[PDB]
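Please predict the structure of the following assembly.
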Amino acid sequence: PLVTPHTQCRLKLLKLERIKDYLLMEEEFIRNQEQMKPLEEKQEEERSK
Amino acid sequence: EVPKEKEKEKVSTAVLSITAKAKKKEKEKEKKEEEKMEVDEAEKKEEKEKKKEPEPNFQLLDNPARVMPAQLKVLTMPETCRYQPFKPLSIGGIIILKDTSEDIEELVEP
Amino acid sequence: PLGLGLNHLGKGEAIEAILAALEVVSEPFRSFANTLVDVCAYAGSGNVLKVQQLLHICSEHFDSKEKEEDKDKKEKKDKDKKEAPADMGAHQGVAVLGIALIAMGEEIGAE
């Protein structure tokens, strides 16, 4: 909640593009999270039955 | 025998932010470093193209000889060899050799 | 390696990474020190392109107990470069590290 120029100024162009940077990276970090998990599980005999 | 070996290995970084001008001025930094100190590396072409075109289509065969029923008509006895067969050799099965001269050898049984 | 980065704290010149990381070109348990003097020169600014190489190279990899210290120390250097853009990235830092870490992670998060 810090968009404090409240007007057409380059700060709010700089502020919001910082926010775009951290959200794209948090997308790409969790995108790599479900990517690079080689697990290929086999369930336990007690749980499967 | 080609089972697989695949790799997930990556998700491509699609950051099209301020990186775009940042990588461009880095390519300017190599235009002072690459072409002004030392660069030479090369490799040769058309070696792998060369061996393909002089190929056979005159494949000799011993006589335990598998033969397709299509290629019964396109096989040819060696006329440069003297030992010629007896039946017109254009159909698969068994034929006998008309052995001409002398000095017969090379019998094989496993 | 910490007093190295303490001897080279706070300059975003990226020569100190060219100094130190090419100096200790070595085996990976000594290349644990690669992330130290890199980002000790990176106390606080907006250099978000460093923050993505602070994530993308050693992100998870599932890593059966070999370099698990390095991803912790790579996360350790994510802690600074966050404590002085004056709360601009501190909200983003608590947004990331609460989510994809402890609520979506392993030895990196829960240790």
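The two ends of chain A are 52 Å apart (CA to CA). DSSP finds two helices and no strands in chain A.
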